[PDB]
Structures are given as C-alpha cells and as structure tokens.
Amino acid sequence: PKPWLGAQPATVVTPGVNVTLRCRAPQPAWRFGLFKPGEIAPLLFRDVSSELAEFFLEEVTPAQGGIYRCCYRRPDWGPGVWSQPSDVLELLVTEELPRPSLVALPGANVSLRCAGRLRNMSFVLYREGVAAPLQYRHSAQPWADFTLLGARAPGTYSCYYHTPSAPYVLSQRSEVLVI
C-alpha cells in the first residue's frame, strides 16, 4: 500500500525558505525513504516507529527541488523490499516562475487566455500604455481567460502570474500578443 507525500508551506517556493516534506504510510512502519529520479538509494531517510515521517528541508535551493517519491519499509520485510511508492511530489524552488503564454481564443467580445504551467495561480493582464493591471483573475486550472469588449479589444497585451499568497513567487512576463 502506497504512502502519501505532501509539502508545507507549499509546493512552489522562493529559495531561502524552509520546507517540510511529510510522508504518511497507511500502516505503522520502521523506515521512511525519500527518493529522487535516477538514484536507486534514498536521498534522505528517517527511522521512526510511526505512520508518519517528516523531513525538514532548510533554506531551500534548487538542489532541493525536483521530483520526490516516498517509500516505506517494515523491518520484518525481505532484504530490499520497500512499499509501493507514493504518487510523485515535485517541489519547485525558484525566484522566477516559468513564463506564461498569452494567446487569442476563438470567437462583440474578444477572448484571451493566459496559460502558464502551474495550478492555483493568480493571473494578471496588462495592456501596453496602461500602468495598472488591466484585469486579474485567480484560477485553479493553470490559465485565466480575460474578455475584451468591442472597441477596447485593439492593443498590445501581456500577462504574468504569481502564487496566490505571500511571500509571492512571480513569473516573468509573457511575450506580447497584438490584437
């Protein structure tokens, strides 16, 4: 039975902060291991006698990012037997979130989509010549759709997105989309 692996405070963070990775097995275990892609031995492990093991990652750098899985092990199990792995948990430690893309949608009212590669983000649309955000939208899906009404449609637009709470991790600005 696979354990579960979760991150606090978040799964996307700025370098410097502290992260706790928590692996919960569905039954009591002896050893918990955190595994990265391409390495067969666990990167880190804890011998606890619990369903739960916690790995404190201090002042994180991009070395602490990447794909994580957790596996656990009971001592009465055969040599080299671990449990099924948890679903992956990928930790993104970065000062700049990947650039989103602003594209025109099919369709009077024009529709734009600002698409990034992360879920649960806040998206902000700008029109060149205007200093304050033209529009803004929080989305669960990794995109936001903004609508432009008639004679307002023409212009040069760009968007970006950021984490929905402080401290903020900001993406770079999309390339411009001319309408």
Side-chain angles (χ1 to χ4, degrees), residues 1-148 150-179:
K2 70 178 163 184
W4 173 77
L5 176 67
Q8 290 299 302
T11 226
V12 184
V13 292
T14 61
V17 316
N18 294 317
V19 172
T20 301
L21 292 194
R22 275 182 189 82
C23 176
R24 176 70 177 276
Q27 58 183 358
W30 150 66
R31 172 164 293 179
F32 291 70
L34 245 48
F35 294 83
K36 300 296 236 89
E39 322 287 289
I40 102 283
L43 181 84
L44 310 171
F45 69 96
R46 287 239 283 125
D47 298 344
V48 317
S49 270
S50 175
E51 289 186 3
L52 167 90
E54 315 162 284
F55 307 80
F56 190 55
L57 306 175
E58 283 229 282
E59 60 167 20
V60 297
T61 63
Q64 279 68 41
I67 294 266
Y68 286 88
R69 297 185 177 77
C70 170
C71 277
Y72 69 88
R73 175 155 161 72
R74 293 182 149 191
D76 57 323
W77 290 353
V81 178
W82 297 74
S83 70
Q84 329 301 335
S86 68
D87 300 340
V88 318
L89 179 280
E90 33 207 326
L91 199 73
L92 183 46
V93 184
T94 192
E95 324 221 299
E96 170 193 11
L97 308 173
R99 208 176 213 196
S101 51
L102 189 52
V103 303
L105 263 19
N109 297 341
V110 165
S111 285
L112 305 187
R113 165 164 309 187
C114 181
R117 74 158 297 261
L118 301 177
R119 305 182 59 83
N120 192 247
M121 293 289 149
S122 285
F123 294 78
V124 189
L125 184 69
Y126 290 86
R127 160 194 298 147
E128 171 173 357
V130 175
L134 197 61
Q135 292 190 229
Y136 55 91
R137 166 163 298 194
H138 184 280
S139 180
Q141 299 302 99
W143 75 83
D145 282 351
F146 310 95
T147 290
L148 309 152
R152 320 311 280 288
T156 293
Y157 297 89
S158 60
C159 62
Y160 83 110
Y161 65 94
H162 61 69
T163 48
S165 86
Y168 295 119
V169 199
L170 275 51
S171 94
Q172 202 70 262
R173 282 274 261 276
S174 65
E175 325 256 18
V176 310
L177 177 64
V178 174
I179 286 132

